[PDB]
Amino acid sequence: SSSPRPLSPLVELNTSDLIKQKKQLWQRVQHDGAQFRSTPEERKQFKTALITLWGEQYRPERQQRWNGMMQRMAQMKWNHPELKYMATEDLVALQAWTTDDYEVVQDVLEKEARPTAHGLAFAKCIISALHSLPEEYSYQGTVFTGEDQLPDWVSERYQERSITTDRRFFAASETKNASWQGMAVEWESNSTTGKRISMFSERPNEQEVLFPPGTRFQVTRIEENETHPRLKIYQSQIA
């Protein structure tokens, strides 16, 4: 009888055996592929995760933020009828991905990551959004990424002539803009179904393409340099 809605309007996140939850989610991602979809219950869990992400004292502010994102995305579905089958909370997840909230979810399905309930809830709605966006949101072209990862991080995940099944939310840009920092690792990735999320982003001047965990890349070449980029990865998305 605890936490009735008039006293506690957010559903509590499932905190039991997070390692098992992460294993079950990764199995589902691989099995469901492009048919992965968040359930109504998972969308409500994602609502709790987002509103509570900063702790109790920020829930009133983050509730207002949540309401504003929901309104923006409901309006977006109306103004862009190709999106009318999207779940509003899945679109909100794409907007949330483009905020600083991304750190809770980017790596949550990595084998060695410590999972959190918040990250797992975010992940389900982002993955659902990416696989439910219509095909006109897919980008066909080379997309660009830079990250400050260590050499062993790269070699644990990418090998020339091998297929990487990426467990990360892997972000890239359609454009290779000048940047203030030369990154330790760069990628050139050929996208076939990577999804353009600029329409949903909080940084509308960006042209971000986002791949979900489970994306497969044929790694064709890894270049080494003595200075940045220490590693440059050339890879191509495959079915």
Author numbering: 58 to 296
Give verbatim excerpts from the published study on this entry:
XopAI, encoded by XAC3230 in Xac, is a putative type III effector composed of 296 amino acids. XopAI resembles a bent right hand, and it can be dissected as a two-lobe structure with an N-terminal α-helical lobe (residues 74 to 193), and a C-terminal β-sandwich lobe (residues 194 to 296). XopAI possesses a highly negatively charged surface at its central cleft, whereas a positively charged surface is required for interacting electrostatically with the negatively charged phosphate group of NAD+ in mARTs. From analyses of the crystal packing, we found that XopAI uses an altered mART domain to bind its own N-terminal peptide containing a conserved Arg residue.
However, the P41212 crystals diffract to a resolution of 1.53 Å and the structure was solved via molecular replacement. Similarly, the first 58 residues of XopAI in the P41212 crystals were not built in the model. For the protein interaction mode found in the P41212 crystals, the central cleft binds residues 59 to 70 from an adjacent protein, and it has an interface area of 673 Å2. In the P41212 crystals, the backbone of the Arg peptide adopts a “W”-shaped conformation in the central cleft. The N-terminus of Arg peptide is placed at the left side of the central cleft, whereas the C-terminus protrudes out of the middle of the cleft. In the P41212 crystals, the residues of the N- and C-termini interact with the PN loop. In the P41212 mode, the backbone oxygen atoms from residues W154 and T156 form three obvious hydrogen bonds with the R62* guanidinium group. The bound R62* in the P41212 mode did not change drastically in conformation through the entire simulation. The loop structure found in the P41212 peptide-bound state is in a stretched conformation, whereas that in the monomer D of the ΔN70 crystal structure is in a contracted conformation. For example, the central cleft in the P41212 peptide-bound state has a volume of 722 Å3; however, that in the monomer D of the ΔN70 crystal structure has a volume of 159 Å3.
